[PDB]
Amino acid sequence: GPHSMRYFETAVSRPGLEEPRYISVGYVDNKEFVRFDSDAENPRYEPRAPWMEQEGPEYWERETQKAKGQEQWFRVSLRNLLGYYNQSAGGSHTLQQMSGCDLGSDWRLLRGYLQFAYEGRDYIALNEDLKTWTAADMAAQITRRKWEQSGAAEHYKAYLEGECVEWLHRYLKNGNATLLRTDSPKAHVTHHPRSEVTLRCWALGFYPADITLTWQLNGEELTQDMELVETRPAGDGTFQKWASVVVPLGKEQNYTCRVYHEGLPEPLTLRWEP
C-alpha cells in the first residue's frame, strides 16, 4: 500500500498573551507519531507511538532544535501578517503550515506539499512542481514576491524530495506492524419504530477512517431522505459511522445497506435481521 508523512504546525496568539504558542505534530500514514508544544515546561519533541520510542537521544535533540527555530520563524511571520492585513493589536490570530511527502506503493515520491494558512484561510502554497508558488490574497503577494526571488522553493524541494522521503522509509520499516494493518468494518443494522420504521446501518471497528455507507431499494441508492453522521473516532484507534433510512414497517428487508472500505476484500451488503 501507499504511505505518507506530514507535519502540521500552528502558532496562535491571543489578546491576553504576550507571546504566541507554537505546536507541531508529525504523522506517518495519518497517525500521530511526534509532538512539540511550547507551553510545556522544558518544551520538547516527544514520541506518540510505541514504535518511535526506539529512536535515539540525539534524534530527539535535533528535532527539538528545529522546533525552536520554527517557533521564532512563526513569531516573526505573525508580526508581519498583522501589518500585511492592517490588523490592530488585541485580537486572536493563527498561522498554520502543512508539509510532507506522499509515496506510492513502491515507496517512491508521488508528491510533495507545503501550504500555509492565515486565520484558517489559504495564504500561500508551493505548487506540485515544487518550483512555483500560488498565493490568492492581495496581501499575500508581498510574500510571493520575496520567495520568488530567493530560492525558497529550491530549499523546500530538497527537503520534500530528500529527507522527507528517506526518514519516512526509516519510520516505515521500524513501526511496520501498527501502520500496515487495516481494520475492516464490522457492520449491522438496528431497528427503531416510528409513525414507518427507522433502519440504522452501523459500521464499527474500522481503520483508516475513510468509508462509505449507502442504502438501496430495488437497485437505486437513495440520495435524499437518508440521514448520517460524520465519521468519528471510537477513541481506541478505530472509527464509527452510521447511516439511517426511514421505511414503512413491513417494507423492511427490501432495503440493503452497503459498506465500502479499503480493508474489505469486497463491499459488504446487509439487510435488517430479526
Partner: peptide, 7 residues
Amino acid sequence: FAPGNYP
C-alpha cells in the same frame, strides 16, 4: 524528521 523553514 521535521522541516526547517527557509530563513
